[PDB]
Structure formats: structure tokens, C-alpha cells
PDB file of C-alpha atoms in Angstrom:
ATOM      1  CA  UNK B   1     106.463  93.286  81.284  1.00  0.00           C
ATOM      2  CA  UNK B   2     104.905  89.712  82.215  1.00  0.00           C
ATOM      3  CA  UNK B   3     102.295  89.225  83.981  1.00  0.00           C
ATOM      4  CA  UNK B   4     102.527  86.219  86.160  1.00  0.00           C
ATOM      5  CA  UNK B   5      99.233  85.965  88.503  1.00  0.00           C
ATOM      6  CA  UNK B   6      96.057  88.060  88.242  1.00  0.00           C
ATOM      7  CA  UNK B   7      92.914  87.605  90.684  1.00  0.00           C
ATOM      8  CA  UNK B   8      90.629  90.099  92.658  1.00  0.00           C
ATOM      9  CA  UNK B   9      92.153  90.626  96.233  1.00  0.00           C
ATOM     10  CA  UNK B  10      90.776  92.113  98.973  1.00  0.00           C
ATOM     11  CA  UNK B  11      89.081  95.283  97.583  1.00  0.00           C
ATOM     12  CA  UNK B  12      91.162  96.256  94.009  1.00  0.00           C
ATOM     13  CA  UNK B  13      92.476  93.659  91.343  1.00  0.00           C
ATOM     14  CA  UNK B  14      95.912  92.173  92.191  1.00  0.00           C
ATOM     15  CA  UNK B  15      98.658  91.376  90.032  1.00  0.00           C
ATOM     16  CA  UNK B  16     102.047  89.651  90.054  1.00  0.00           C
ATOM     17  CA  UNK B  17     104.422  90.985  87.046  1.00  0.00           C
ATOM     18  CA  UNK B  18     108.060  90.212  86.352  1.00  0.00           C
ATOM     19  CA  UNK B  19     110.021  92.923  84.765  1.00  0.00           C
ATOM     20  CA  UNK B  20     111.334  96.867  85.490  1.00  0.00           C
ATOM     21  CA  UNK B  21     108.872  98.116  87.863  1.00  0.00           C
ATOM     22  CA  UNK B  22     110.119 102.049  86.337  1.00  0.00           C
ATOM     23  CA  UNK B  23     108.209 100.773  82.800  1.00  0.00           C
ATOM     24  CA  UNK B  24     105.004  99.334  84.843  1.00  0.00           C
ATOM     25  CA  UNK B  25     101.280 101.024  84.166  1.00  0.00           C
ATOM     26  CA  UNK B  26     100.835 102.625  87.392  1.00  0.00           C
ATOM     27  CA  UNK B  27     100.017 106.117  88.852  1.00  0.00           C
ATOM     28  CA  UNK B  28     102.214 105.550  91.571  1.00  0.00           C
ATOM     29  CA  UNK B  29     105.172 103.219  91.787  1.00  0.00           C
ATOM     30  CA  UNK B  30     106.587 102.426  95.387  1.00  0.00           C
ATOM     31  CA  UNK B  31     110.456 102.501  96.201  1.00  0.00           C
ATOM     32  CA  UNK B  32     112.061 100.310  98.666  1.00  0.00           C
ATOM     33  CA  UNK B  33     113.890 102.904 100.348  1.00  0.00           C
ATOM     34  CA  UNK B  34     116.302 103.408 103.694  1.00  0.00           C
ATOM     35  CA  UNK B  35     114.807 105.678 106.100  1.00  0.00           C
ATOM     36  CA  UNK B  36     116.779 108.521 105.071  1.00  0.00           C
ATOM     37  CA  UNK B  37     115.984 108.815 101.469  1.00  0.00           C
ATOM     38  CA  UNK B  38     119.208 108.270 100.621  1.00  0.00           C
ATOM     39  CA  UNK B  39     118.848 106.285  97.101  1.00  0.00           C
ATOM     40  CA  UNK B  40     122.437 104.570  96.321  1.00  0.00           C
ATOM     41  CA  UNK B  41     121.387 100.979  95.175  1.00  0.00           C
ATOM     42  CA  UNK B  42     119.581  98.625  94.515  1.00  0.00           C
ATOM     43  CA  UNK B  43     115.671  99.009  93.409  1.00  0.00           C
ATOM     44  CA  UNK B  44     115.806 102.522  94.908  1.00  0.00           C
ATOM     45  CA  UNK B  45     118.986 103.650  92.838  1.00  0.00           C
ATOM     46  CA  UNK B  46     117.077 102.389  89.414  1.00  0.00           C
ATOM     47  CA  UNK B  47     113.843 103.997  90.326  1.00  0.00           C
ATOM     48  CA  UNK B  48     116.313 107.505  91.588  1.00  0.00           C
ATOM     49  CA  UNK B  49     118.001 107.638  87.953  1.00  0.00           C
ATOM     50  CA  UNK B  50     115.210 106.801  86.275  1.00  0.00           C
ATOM     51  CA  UNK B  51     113.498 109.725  87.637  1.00  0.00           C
ATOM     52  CA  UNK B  52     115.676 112.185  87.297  1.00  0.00           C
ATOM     53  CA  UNK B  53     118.991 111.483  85.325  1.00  0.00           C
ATOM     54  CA  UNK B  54     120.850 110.722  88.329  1.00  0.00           C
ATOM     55  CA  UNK B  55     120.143 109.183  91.701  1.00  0.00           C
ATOM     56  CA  UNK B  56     122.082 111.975  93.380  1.00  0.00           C
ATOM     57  CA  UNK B  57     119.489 114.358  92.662  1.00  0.00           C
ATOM     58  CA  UNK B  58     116.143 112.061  93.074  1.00  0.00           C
ATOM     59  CA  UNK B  59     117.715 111.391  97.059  1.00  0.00           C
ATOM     60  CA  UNK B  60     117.894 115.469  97.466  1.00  0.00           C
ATOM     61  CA  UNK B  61     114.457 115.977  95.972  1.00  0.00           C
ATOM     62  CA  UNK B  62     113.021 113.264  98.686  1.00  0.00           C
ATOM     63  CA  UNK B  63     115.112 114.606 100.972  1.00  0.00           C
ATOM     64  CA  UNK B  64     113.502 118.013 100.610  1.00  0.00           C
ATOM     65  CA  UNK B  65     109.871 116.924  99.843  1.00  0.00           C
ATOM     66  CA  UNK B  66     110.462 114.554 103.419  1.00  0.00           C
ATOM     67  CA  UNK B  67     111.316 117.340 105.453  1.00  0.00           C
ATOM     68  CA  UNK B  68     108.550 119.321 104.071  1.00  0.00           C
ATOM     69  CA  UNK B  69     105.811 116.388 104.716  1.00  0.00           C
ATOM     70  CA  UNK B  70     107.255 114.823 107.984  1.00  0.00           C
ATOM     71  CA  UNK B  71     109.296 117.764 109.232  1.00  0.00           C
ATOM     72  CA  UNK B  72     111.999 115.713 110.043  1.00  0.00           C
ATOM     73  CA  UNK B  73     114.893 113.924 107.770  1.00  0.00           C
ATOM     74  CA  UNK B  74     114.032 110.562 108.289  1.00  0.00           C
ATOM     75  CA  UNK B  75     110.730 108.066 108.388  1.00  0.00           C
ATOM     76  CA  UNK B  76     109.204 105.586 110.223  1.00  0.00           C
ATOM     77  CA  UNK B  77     108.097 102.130 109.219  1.00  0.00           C
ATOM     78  CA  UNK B  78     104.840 102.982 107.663  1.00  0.00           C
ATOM     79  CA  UNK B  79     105.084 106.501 106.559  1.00  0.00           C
ATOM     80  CA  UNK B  80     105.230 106.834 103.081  1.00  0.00           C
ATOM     81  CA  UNK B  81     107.021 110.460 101.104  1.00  0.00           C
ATOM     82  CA  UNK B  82     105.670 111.351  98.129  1.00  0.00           C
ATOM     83  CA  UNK B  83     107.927 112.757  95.554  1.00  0.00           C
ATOM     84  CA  UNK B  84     106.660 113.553  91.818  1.00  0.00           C
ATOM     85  CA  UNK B  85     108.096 111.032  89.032  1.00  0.00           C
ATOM     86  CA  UNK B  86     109.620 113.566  87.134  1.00  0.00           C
ATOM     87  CA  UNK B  87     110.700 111.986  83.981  1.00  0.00           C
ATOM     88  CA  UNK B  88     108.279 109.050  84.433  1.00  0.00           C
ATOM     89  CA  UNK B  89     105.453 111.071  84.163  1.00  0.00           C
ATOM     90  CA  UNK B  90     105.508 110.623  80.515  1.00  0.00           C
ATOM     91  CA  UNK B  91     104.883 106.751  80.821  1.00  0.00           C
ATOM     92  CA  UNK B  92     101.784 107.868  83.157  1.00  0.00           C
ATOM     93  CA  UNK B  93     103.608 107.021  86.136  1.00  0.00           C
ATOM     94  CA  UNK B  94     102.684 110.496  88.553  1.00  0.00           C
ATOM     95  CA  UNK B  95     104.697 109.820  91.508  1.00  0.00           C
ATOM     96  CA  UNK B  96     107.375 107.791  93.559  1.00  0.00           C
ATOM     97  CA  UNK B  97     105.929 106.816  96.800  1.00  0.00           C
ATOM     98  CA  UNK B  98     109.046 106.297  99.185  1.00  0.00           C
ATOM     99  CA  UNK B  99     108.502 103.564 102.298  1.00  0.00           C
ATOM    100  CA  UNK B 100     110.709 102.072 104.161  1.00  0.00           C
ATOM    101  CA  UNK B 101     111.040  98.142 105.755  1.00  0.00           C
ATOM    102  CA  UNK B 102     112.888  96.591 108.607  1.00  0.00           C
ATOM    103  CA  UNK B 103     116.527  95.051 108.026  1.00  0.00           C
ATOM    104  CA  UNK B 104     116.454  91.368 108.446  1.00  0.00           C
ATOM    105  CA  UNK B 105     119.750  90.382 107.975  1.00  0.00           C
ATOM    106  CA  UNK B 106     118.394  86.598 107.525  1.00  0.00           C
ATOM    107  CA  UNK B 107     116.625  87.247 110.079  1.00  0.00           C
ATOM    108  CA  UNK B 108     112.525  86.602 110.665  1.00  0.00           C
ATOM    109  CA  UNK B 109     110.089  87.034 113.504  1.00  0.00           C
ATOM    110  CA  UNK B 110     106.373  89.067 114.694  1.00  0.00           C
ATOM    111  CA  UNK B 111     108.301  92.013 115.079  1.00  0.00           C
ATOM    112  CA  UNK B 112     109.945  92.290 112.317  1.00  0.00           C
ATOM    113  CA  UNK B 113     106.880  91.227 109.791  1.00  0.00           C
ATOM    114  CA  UNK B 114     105.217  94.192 111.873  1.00  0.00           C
ATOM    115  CA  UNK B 115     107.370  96.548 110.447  1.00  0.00           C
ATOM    116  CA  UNK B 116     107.430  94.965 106.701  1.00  0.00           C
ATOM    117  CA  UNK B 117     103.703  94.728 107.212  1.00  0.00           C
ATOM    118  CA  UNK B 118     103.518  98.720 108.090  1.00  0.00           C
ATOM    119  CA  UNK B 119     105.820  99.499 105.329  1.00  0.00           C
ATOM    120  CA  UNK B 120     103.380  97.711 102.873  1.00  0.00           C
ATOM    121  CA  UNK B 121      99.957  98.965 104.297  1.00  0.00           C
ATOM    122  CA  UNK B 122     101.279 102.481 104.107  1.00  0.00           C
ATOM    123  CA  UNK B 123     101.861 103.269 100.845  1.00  0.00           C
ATOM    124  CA  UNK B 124      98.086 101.440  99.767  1.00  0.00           C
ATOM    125  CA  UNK B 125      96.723 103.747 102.963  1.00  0.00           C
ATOM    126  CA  UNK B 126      98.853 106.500 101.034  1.00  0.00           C
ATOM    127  CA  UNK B 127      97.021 106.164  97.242  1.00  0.00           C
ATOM    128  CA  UNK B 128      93.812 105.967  98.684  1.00  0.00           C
ATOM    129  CA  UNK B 129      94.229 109.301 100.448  1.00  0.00           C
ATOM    130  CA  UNK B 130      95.483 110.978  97.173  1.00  0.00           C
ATOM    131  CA  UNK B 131      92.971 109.292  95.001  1.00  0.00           C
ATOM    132  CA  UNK B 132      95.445 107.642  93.226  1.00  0.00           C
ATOM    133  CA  UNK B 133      93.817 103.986  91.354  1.00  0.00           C
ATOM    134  CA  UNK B 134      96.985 101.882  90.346  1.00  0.00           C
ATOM    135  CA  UNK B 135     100.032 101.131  92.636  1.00  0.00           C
ATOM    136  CA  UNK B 136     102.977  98.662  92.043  1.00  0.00           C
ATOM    137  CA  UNK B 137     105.733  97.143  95.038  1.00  0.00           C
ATOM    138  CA  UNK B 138     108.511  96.342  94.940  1.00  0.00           C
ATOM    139  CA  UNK B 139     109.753  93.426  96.975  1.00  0.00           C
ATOM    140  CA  UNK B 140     110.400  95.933 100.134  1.00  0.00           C
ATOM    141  CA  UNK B 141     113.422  94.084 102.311  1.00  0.00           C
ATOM    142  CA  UNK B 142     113.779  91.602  99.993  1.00  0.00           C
ATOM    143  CA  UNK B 143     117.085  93.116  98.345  1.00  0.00           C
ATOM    144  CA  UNK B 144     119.893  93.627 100.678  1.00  0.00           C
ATOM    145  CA  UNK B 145     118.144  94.123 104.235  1.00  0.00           C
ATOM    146  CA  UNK B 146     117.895  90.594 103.757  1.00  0.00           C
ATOM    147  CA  UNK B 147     113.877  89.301 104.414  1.00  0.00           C
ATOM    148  CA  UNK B 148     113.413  85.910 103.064  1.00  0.00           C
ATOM    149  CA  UNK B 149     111.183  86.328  99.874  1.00  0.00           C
ATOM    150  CA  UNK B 150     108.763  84.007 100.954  1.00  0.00           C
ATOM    151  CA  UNK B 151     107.788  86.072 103.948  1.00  0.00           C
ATOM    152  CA  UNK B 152     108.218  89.152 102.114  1.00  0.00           C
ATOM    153  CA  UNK B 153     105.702  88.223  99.569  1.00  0.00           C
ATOM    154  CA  UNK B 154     103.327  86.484 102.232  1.00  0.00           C
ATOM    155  CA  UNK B 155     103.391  90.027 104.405  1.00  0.00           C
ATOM    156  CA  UNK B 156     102.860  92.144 101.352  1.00  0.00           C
ATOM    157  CA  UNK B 157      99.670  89.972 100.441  1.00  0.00           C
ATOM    158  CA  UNK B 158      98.284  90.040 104.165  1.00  0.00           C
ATOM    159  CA  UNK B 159      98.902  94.095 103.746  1.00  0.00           C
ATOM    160  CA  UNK B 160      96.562  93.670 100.325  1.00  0.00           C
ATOM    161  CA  UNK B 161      94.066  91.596 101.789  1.00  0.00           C
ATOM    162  CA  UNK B 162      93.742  93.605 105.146  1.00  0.00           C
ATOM    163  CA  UNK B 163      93.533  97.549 102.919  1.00  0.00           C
ATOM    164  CA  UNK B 164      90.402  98.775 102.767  1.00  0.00           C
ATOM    165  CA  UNK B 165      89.964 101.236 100.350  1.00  0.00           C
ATOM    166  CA  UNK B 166      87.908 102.500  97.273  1.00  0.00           C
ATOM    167  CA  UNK B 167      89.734 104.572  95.194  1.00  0.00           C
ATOM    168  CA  UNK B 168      92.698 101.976  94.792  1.00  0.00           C
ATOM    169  CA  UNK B 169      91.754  99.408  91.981  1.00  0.00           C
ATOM    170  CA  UNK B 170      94.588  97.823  90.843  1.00  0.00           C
ATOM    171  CA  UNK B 171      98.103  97.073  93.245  1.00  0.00           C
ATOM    172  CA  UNK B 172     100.936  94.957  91.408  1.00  0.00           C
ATOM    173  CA  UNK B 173     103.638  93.397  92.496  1.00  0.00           C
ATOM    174  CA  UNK B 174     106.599  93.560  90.208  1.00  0.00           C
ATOM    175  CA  UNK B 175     110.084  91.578  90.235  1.00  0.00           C
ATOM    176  CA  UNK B 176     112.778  92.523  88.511  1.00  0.00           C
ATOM    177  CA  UNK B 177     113.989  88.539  88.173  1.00  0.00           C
ATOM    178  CA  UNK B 178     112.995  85.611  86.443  1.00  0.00           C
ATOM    179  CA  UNK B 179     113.941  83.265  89.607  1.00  0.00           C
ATOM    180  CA  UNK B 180     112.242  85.336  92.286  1.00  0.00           C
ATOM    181  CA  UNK B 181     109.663  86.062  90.216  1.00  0.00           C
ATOM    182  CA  UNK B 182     108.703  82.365  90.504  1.00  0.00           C
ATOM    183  CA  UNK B 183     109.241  82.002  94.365  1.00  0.00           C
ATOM    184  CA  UNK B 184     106.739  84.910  94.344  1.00  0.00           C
ATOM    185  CA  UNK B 185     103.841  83.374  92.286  1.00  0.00           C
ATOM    186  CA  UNK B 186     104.173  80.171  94.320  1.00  0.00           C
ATOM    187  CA  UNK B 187     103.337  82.069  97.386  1.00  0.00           C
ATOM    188  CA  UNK B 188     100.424  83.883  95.049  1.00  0.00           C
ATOM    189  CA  UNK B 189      99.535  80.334  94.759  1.00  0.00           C
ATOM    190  CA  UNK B 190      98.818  79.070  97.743  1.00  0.00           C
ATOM    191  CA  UNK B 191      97.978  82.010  99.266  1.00  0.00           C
ATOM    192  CA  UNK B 192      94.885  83.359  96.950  1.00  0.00           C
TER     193      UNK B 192
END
């Protein structure tokens, strides 16, 4: 795990990390999911497996724990399902919290940052509620709902600078590549 960009951020300590967000120091680790829980690649598929041995069963368990906490099989932009990590818990990671971002398709405008901007806000919104003190991202529609990066990163840090909270300390961003990882700290950059 590297950590790229460190600085205090609205009302916790921010940081920017490149590596496997299912190895990062955090209570609660965020997946980039579909809005049906339904974990069959990407980010979501890692953090699935890594949980439990195989995706298959992770995207059941949400499944179950979604219908118990929204009473519905599905979620809105913003609402965040909170499954327990399972066989992360040993690397002090407590739970997967599930949110879900717009599909982009190249696409960008108010609208659709609204959405990305929800699916960001909610899971910080989420911690604080459960007392939980570290959080890490993933990129949410960065992988293959297509957001450009750039506006990806810049919605996530509006969503950072906009939480207010006071049991949430420490939020990181983590990125999986070497070459996005870069695009994100130049945003980080100019934008802290």
C-alpha cells in the first residue's frame, strides 16, 4: 500500500493510496456496487471473494442483509447496505459498505455528478451513524459505468469536503493502478 497524498480535509484526515483497497487499514471499506448487489466484476467481484471465498455468496449475503435494511432488492443512489467483512475482519476491516453510482457511459453532466455525488456522501453519512472512524473508496463509476476519472475524483472530494461529521477521522481513497493512481493525485493537487 502507497500512500500518494495526505492533508486534513474537511472535518477527518484525507488520504490518496494506490494499491488493493481489500488490504487497506480501515473499519469500513466501500464497494462500487450495481444497484442490485449483484457482485460479478470488477472492484466489487475482488472485494465479494475476498470476503467470503467466492463472490457468489458475498452478492447473496448483500442481497439478504439489503432486503432486511431497505426492504426492497435494490438501492438508490445514496443509500448505502451494510454487510459484515467476514474474512476481512481479521485485517481489522469490520464491514463492506455497498453504494451504488450512476452509469456514464462517457458520459458527464449536473445530473449525473448528483448521483456520483450521493453515492459518495452516503457511505461517509453511513460511518458516522455507526460510529465507525476510518473509511476507504473506491473510484465509484470509474470502472466500467464509464465516469471520466477526473470528475470522479473531483465529486468524491466535493462529497469529503461538504461531510460533516465527528466520529469519521480518516477517509482514503484507494486505486488499484499505478496510471490512475496518478490522474487521481493531480486532481488531489489542485484541488486541496
Amino acid at each position: 500500500m502507497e500512500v500518494l497524498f495526505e492533508a486534513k480535509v474537511g472535518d477527518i484526515t484525507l488520504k490518496l493510496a494506490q494499491g488493493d483497497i481489500t488490504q487497506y487499514p480501515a473499519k469500513a471499506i466501500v464497494n462500487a456496487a450495481n444497484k442490485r448487489l449483484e457482485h460479478g466484476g470488477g472492484v466489487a467481484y475482488a472485494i465479494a471473494k475476498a470476503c467470503a471465498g467466492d463472490a457468489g455468496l458475498y452478492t447473496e449475503i448483500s442481497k439478504k442483509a439489503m432486503r432486511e435494511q431497505f426492504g426492497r432488492d435494490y438501492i438508490d443512489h445514496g443509500e448505502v447496505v451494510v454487510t459484515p467483512a467476514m474474512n476481512l475482519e481479521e485485517r481489522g476491516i469490520k464491514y463492506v459498505f455497498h453504494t451504488v453510482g450512476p452509469i456514464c457511459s462517457g458520459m458527464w453532466s449536473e445530473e449525473l455528478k448528483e448521483k456520483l455525488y450521493k453515492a459518495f456522501l452516503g457511505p461517509l453519512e453511513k460511518a458516522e451513524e455507526m460510529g465507525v472512524e476510518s473509511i476507504a473508496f473506491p473510484a465509484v463509476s470509474a470502472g466500467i459505468y464509464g465516469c471520466d476519472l477526473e470528475k470522479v475524483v473531483e465529486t468524491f472530494l466535493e462529497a469529503v469536503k461538504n461531510f460533516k461529521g465527528s466520529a469519521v477521522k480518516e477517509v482514503a481513497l484507494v486505486i488499484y493502478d499505478r496510471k490512475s493512481a496518478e490522474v487521481a493525485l493531480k486532481v488531489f493537487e489542485r484541488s486541496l
